[PDB]
Enzyme design. Sequence first.
Site, PDB file in Angstrom:
ATOM      1  N   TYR A  33     -13.862  -9.198  -2.881  1.00  0.00           N
ATOM      2  CA  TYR A  33     -12.439  -8.951  -2.592  1.00  0.00           C
ATOM      3  C   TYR A  33     -11.481  -9.278  -3.762  1.00  0.00           C
ATOM      4  O   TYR A  33     -11.375  -8.494  -4.705  1.00  0.00           O
ATOM      5  CB  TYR A  33     -12.058  -9.669  -1.281  1.00  0.00           C
ATOM      6  CG  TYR A  33     -10.991  -9.033  -0.408  1.00  0.00           C
ATOM      7  CD1 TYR A  33     -10.712  -7.672  -0.485  1.00  0.00           C
ATOM      8  CD2 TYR A  33     -10.332  -9.778   0.574  1.00  0.00           C
ATOM      9  CE1 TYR A  33      -9.777  -7.081   0.339  1.00  0.00           C
ATOM     10  CE2 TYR A  33      -9.393  -9.182   1.414  1.00  0.00           C
ATOM     11  CZ  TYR A  33      -9.130  -7.817   1.292  1.00  0.00           C
ATOM     12  OH  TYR A  33      -8.188  -7.157   2.087  1.00  0.00           O
TER      13      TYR A  33
ATOM     14  N   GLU B  46     -11.700   0.420  -2.672  1.00  0.00           N
ATOM     15  CA  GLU B  46     -10.685  -0.622  -2.634  1.00  0.00           C
ATOM     16  C   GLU B  46     -10.710  -1.441  -3.926  1.00  0.00           C
ATOM     17  O   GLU B  46      -9.672  -1.678  -4.527  1.00  0.00           O
ATOM     18  CB  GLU B  46     -10.913  -1.493  -1.412  1.00  0.00           C
ATOM     19  CG  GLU B  46      -9.720  -2.338  -1.002  1.00  0.00           C
ATOM     20  CD  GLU B  46      -9.922  -2.999   0.323  1.00  0.00           C
ATOM     21  OE1 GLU B  46      -9.070  -3.837   0.730  1.00  0.00           O
ATOM     22  OE2 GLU B  46     -10.938  -2.659   0.955  1.00  0.00           O
TER      23      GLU B  46
ATOM     24  N   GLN C  66       5.015  -8.718   2.382  1.00  0.00           N
ATOM     25  CA  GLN C  66       4.079  -8.425   1.314  1.00  0.00           C
ATOM     26  C   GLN C  66       4.829  -8.206  -0.004  1.00  0.00           C
ATOM     27  O   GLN C  66       6.057  -8.156  -0.012  1.00  0.00           O
ATOM     28  CB  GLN C  66       3.217  -7.194   1.662  1.00  0.00           C
ATOM     29  CG  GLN C  66       1.754  -7.515   1.889  1.00  0.00           C
ATOM     30  CD  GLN C  66       0.895  -6.269   2.026  1.00  0.00           C
ATOM     31  OE1 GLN C  66       1.378  -5.119   1.977  1.00  0.00           O
ATOM     32  NE2 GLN C  66      -0.395  -6.483   2.132  1.00  0.00           N
TER      33      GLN C  66
ATOM     34  N   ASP D 148      -5.743 -11.586  -0.615  1.00  0.00           N
ATOM     35  CA  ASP D 148      -5.952 -12.428   0.546  1.00  0.00           C
ATOM     36  C   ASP D 148      -6.826 -13.638   0.322  1.00  0.00           C
ATOM     37  O   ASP D 148      -6.499 -14.722   0.808  1.00  0.00           O
ATOM     38  CB  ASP D 148      -6.573 -11.612   1.682  1.00  0.00           C
ATOM     39  CG  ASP D 148      -5.817 -10.351   1.992  1.00  0.00           C
ATOM     40  OD1 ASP D 148      -4.833 -10.030   1.274  1.00  0.00           O
ATOM     41  OD2 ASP D 148      -6.248  -9.663   2.945  1.00  0.00           O
TER      42      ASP D 148
ATOM     43  N   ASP E 117       0.847  -1.201   0.000  1.00  0.00           N
ATOM     44  CA  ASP E 117       0.000   0.000   0.000  1.00  0.00           C
ATOM     45  C   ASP E 117       0.867   1.229   0.000  1.00  0.00           C
ATOM     46  O   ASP E 117       0.689   2.095  -0.847  1.00  0.00           O
ATOM     47  CB  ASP E 117      -0.990   0.043   1.185  1.00  0.00           C
ATOM     48  CG  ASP E 117      -2.091  -1.015   1.087  1.00  0.00           C
ATOM     49  OD1 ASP E 117      -1.739  -2.218   1.161  1.00  0.00           O
ATOM     50  OD2 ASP E 117      -3.302  -0.649   0.948  1.00  0.00           O
TER      51      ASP E 117
ATOM     52  N   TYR F  49      -9.088  -2.657  14.032  1.00  0.00           N
ATOM     53  CA  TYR F  49      -8.506  -3.686  13.175  1.00  0.00           C
ATOM     54  C   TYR F  49      -8.169  -4.956  13.925  1.00  0.00           C
ATOM     55  O   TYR F  49      -7.556  -4.920  14.991  1.00  0.00           O
ATOM     56  CB  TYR F  49      -7.251  -3.166  12.465  1.00  0.00           C
ATOM     57  CG  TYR F  49      -6.658  -4.173  11.514  1.00  0.00           C
ATOM     58  CD1 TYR F  49      -7.121  -4.266  10.204  1.00  0.00           C
ATOM     59  CD2 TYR F  49      -5.650  -5.065  11.933  1.00  0.00           C
ATOM     60  CE1 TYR F  49      -6.594  -5.200   9.333  1.00  0.00           C
ATOM     61  CE2 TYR F  49      -5.119  -6.003  11.062  1.00  0.00           C
ATOM     62  CZ  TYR F  49      -5.599  -6.069   9.771  1.00  0.00           C
ATOM     63  OH  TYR F  49      -5.090  -6.988   8.893  1.00  0.00           O
TER      64      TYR F  49
END
EC number: 3.2.1.170
Lengths: 413, 413, 413
Positions: free
Chosen positions: C342, C386, C96, C158, C33, C79
Amino acid sequence: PLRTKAVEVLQRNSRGAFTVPAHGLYPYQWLWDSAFIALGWTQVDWERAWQELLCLFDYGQGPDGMLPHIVFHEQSRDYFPGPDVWGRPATSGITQPPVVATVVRYLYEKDPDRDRARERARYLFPKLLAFHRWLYHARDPYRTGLVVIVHPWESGMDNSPAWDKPLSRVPVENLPPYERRDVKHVNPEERPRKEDYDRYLSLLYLFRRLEYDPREIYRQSPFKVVDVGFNAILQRANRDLYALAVLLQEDPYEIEEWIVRGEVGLEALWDREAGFYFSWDLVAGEPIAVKTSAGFLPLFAGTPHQGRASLLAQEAERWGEKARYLLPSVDPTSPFFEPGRYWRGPVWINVNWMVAEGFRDYGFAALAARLKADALALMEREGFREYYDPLTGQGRGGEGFSWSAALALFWTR
Amino acid sequence: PLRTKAVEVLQRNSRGAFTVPAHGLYPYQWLWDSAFIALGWTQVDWERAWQELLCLFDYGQGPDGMLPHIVFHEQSRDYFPGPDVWGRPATSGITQPPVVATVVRYLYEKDPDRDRARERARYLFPKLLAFHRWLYHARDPYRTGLVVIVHPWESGMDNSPAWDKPLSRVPVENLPPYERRDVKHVNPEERPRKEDYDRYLSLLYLFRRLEYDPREIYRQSPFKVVDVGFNAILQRANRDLYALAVLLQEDPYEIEEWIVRGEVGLEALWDREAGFYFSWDLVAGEPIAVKTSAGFLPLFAGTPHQGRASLLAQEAERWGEKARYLLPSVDPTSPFFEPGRYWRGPVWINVNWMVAEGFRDYGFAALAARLKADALALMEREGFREYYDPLTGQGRGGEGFSWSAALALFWTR
Amino acid sequence: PLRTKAVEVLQRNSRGAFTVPAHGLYPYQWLWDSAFIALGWTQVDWERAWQELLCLFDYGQGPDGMLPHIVFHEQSRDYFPGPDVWGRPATSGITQPPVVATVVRYLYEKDPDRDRARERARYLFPKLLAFHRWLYHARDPYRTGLVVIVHPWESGMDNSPAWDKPLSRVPVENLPPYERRDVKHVNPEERPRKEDYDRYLSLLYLFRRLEYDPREIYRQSPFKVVDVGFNAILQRANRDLYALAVLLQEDPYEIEEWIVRGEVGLEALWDREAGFYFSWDLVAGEPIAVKTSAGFLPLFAGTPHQGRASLLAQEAERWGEKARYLLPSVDPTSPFFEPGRYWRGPVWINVNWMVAEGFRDYGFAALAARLKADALALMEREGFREYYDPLTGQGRGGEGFSWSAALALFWTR
Ligand SMILES: [Cl-]
C-alpha cells in the site's frame, strides 16, 4: 569615448530642471524616463540628479498622490497626444512603471553629500508613499497585492504583443480625426501602427470623459491588465522604499504589507507549463501567453527562487541563439516578433540593465555580463538610440535617447 | 581525545547551575555563551544542559522580559565592568544575540526524557516569548521587523570593525578613571584598545544615568545599529520558537508576524554592489560597508535565496585564499584585518558552527565540511581557546573557553 | 496505446456524474481521487471533467463547508466501512487532501469554452473558500498556518509508516466485530493489516460518538498529526485559489493570510539533521522521523529554496539506487519498507506526478523526466493499478484504477 558622448546627450536634452527623453520626439518630462536618467546624472552632477526627481514630483504629482506619465512643462506641436488632448503645468491622466523609489534609494545611499542626501530623501519619502498608496487605491481595490494598468502606455512598453488581444476589445467608433506627430521624428515602421494609436486615443477619451476618476476608470476601462513588468518594478520599489524608511527612521506604515502581499501576487504570474512569467488580462480573466522581456523583470524584484531564475536563464539563452544582441523585447521565435518595431522585438537599454542586475543577484554572472556587453556594444556602434535591432544591431526609434546615455554612464561607473 | 578534553573544561568551568565562559577572564554567566554551552552539556548530562538555561532565565530575566548579557552571580575582582559599575543577583543593563530559542528547540526535540523535555519547554516557552517581546518593544518602535543594538557588546562581537565609525561618535569626555581587568588574563594586543573601552563605558554610564529606560536609551544612545548578526540570529530563533509553539500546542501569538516582517528586514541588509550583508548605522542613516563574518549569519536564518547563498559561498572561498583557517571574523584583505585582535580577524568556533549549518542547508556541503574540519583541527592543535589566528592557527584570547569545548562536543556528536 | 486504454477505464468507471476509483474495491466517490480524475477527463470531454467536481461539491459538501473523503452515492456491500458504519446522499465524517483548487485552476485556465470556464469557476470559487475555511476552523484553532488530520485516511496514505507510532495510541478495546471487504478485491498482503483497521474503526466510532463535532474531535482524538502531504497540497491549493480569485476578480479575503502563514508552517516541518520534511505528531509533541514520499510534496507547494530542493533531489536519487522504479512511498532502506503493501513502499502515479511537477519547477529536469518515464513504463507493462512494486514493477492493489489512467492521459497531453 562612450561616456563623454553620453554626458553631452544629457546636457543637450536638459531643460534645466528635467531632461527630455528625446528632442522633438519626446519634448516633455516622462516618469520612468526621468528615474533612469537621474542615475546617469549621478555621474555628472549629483545636485542635478536629485533635481530631476524633485521636478517630477513638484510639478507632476497630483493631490491624490498620483504620479502621471508625462508632465507637459512647455508648449510644443511636436508631440501627440499633448496637454490639450488630455485636457487637464498640465499632465497626462495615466501613470508609468514606479521605478522611482529604487532610484531614490540609490541616490540616497551614494550621494557624497550626506546632508543633501537626507534632505532630499526625507522630502521625497512621503511623496513616494502617497504615490504607491494611490496605486493600490486606484488599481487594487480587491487588495490582491497586484495593480492593474488601464492603458498600454502605463506599462512603458506601448505596443508589446502581450497587449494585442486586450487592445482588440477597445472600441474605435467615431473617433475624432487626429494627426500623429511621432512618425515625423521616427520611421513609421519603427513605431506603433494606426490601429494601435486609434485604440490608445479611444482609451484616453474614455478616461477624460470619466474625469480621470480612479473608481470609474477601473470599472469601465475595456483594457485591464496585470502587467508583470509594472508589478515587478513595483515590488522592487516597495522593497527599496522599505529600506529607505528604516535608514531614515520613518514609520514604514503598510509598506511591509505591500511587500508580502506583492510577493504572493508576483509569483502567481508564473506559468509552469511555459516556464515564464505572463501578464494577465482581467477583462478576459486569463493569462496572456506571450513571452516578452517584461517577464524577466521579477528577477529585478528578487521574488523568484533559484529554479525559476534558472528556467529564465535557459529562456534568455534560447533567445540568444537567434538574436545577435540580448535582450530582445519579445521571443525572437514569436510570430509577433518585429525586429525594428518598438516593443515587439528591439533591444532596450533600460530593460537590459534591470534584467542583468536581476541575473547577477541570482548568480548568473555570465548572462548578466553578456547583457551589459551587448548594451555597451550597441551604444558604441550606433550611438544612443531608443532601441536596437537584435539581429543587426541597427539603431532604431528616438535619436539622442536620454536613458540610453544615462544608463551607459551609470553601468560603467 | 578532543571530546574527553572538552568535557573536562565544561566540568571545570561549571559553577553548579551555570558555566562560566572562562575562569577569571569571564567569571559570570553570559547570555549567548550559556546557550551554545548548553548544547555541549547535551553530550554529558541532559539535566544539566537544561539547567544552564533555567538558571539564565530564573536569575537573569527582569520583569519586562529582558534577558541581560551578564548575570553577575558571584562577587569577583577579576572582571571589569562588574555589577557595581552597572549599578543595578545583579545583572548588566544590555542584551546579547537571542540564540536561546534555537538551543531550546534542539534540547526539546532531542532530550531522551520526553516528560522532562515537555516540562522544561513549557516552562521556558512563555519566558522566551517575553524576551522577544521586549526586543521589539525596546528596540523596534517603528515596527520595522529589525531590532537595534545600542551597544557593541550586544552584538557579541565587541570590537568588530563594523562598529568603528558608529563608536567614533560616542563622547568620551570626563569619564571616571578605571582599571581594566581583561588584560590581566589575555594579551592586550588580543583585546580591544583603550579607545574602544572608553567608548564602551561611556555608553554604559549614559544607560545607567537614563535608568536603563528602554524608551530613553533608544532615543538618546549615540550608538544605534541594526546588527546583521543579532538580527539573523533573532530570525532563526523566531522560526524555532514558532516550531516549539506548534509542537507544544501553544498559541504562537505574534511570532508569525515577527518571522514575516523579519524576513523582509533581514533581506533588506543585502548590498547588491558588494555581494554581501551589512549591518546598518541608523545614527548616520547608512549601511556600514564592512564585510564581517556576521554577514554570513543570514544563512543560519534561512532567509536568502540560493543565488545569494552562492555569492556568499564565493566570498568565503576568497577569504580562504588568504586565510589558512576559515572563517576569519573579517575579510582578511580588509585594511582593518588584525589576525590576533578579537573580532577583527580571528576565527571563532560558534560562528564557524552557525555559518556551516547555514551553508549545509543551502547545499554547500564541501564548504560546510571545511568549516567543521577547520574548527576541529584548530581545537586539536591549540586546545579550546576563545578565538584563533586564521593565518597561523595560534590560540588567542580566553583559555579553557567553554563554548569552544561545548561546540566541539556538539559538532562531533 | 496507453491513452486509448486509459480512456476506457474512465468510461467504464464512470457512474454518470462521478468516477469510482475502482469497480467494487472503491464503489463510491472519493475526494482527492475525483480531483486527479478530473484532469484525465480533460483529455476526453471537458464538460464531464467539470462535472466530476460539481458532483463532489453538490452532493458531498456539508453546510459548514467540509468536503468529506467519500460520498456514498449508491448502496453497496462491496466496501467497508460504508455509510451505515459512519451513520450520517450519505458521506464519511472526515476529509482528504485538498488538491481540488489546484485542479479547478487548471480546468478554468485551459477549458476551450471560456463561458463554461467562468460559470464553473465562479460557481466553485466560494465553495472552495468555505472548504478551506472549514479546514482552518476545525483543524487549526491556534492559527498556526498548519492543519491537523485526525485520522490516517485523511492523509490519503492510509498505512504510511509515519502513522504507526501515532496509531499505537488509539485504543482498540471492545470494538464491534466487523468483516473487511477490501481483502475480497485485493491480496491482503497488499492492504493494511488488521491491527491497522481496528485502529481505523476505533477512531471512526469516537468521531461518530462525538457527533462529528469539529471542536470535540480536535480535543479528544488520540490521533493528531500535522501531515506534510496534506499541508503541502493545501499550500499549493491556496496559491492556486489566490490565482483564481485575481483572475475572476473575486475578493481574495484571507487567502493571502493562509498562504503567508502556511509558508512559515510548511518550512518548519524541515529537519536539517535528516535533510527531509517530516510530518509531526502533536499528541507526542514531536517530529515523526520517517521519510515517506509525502516529504517530497513541498516541492509541489513551491515553498522550499533551491538548496532544500537540492537535498531532496539527492534523497530521491539515493532511493533510486535501490528502487528500480521511482518514487517508492517510503525510503527503500527503511526497516518499514514493504514493496507490495500500500503506502509502505509501492510507487503511486499521483505522487509521481506531483513530485515531478515539483522538481521540474526547481530545475531538476532529469529527475522529473525519470519520474514521468517510470510512471508511464509501469502503466505500459502492468496496466492501470493502484500502486506498483518499486523493485519488480508488478501491479498491486486496485485494478482498473481511475487516477492512474487519468494521470496517464493528463501527463501525456
Ligand atoms: Cl532559492
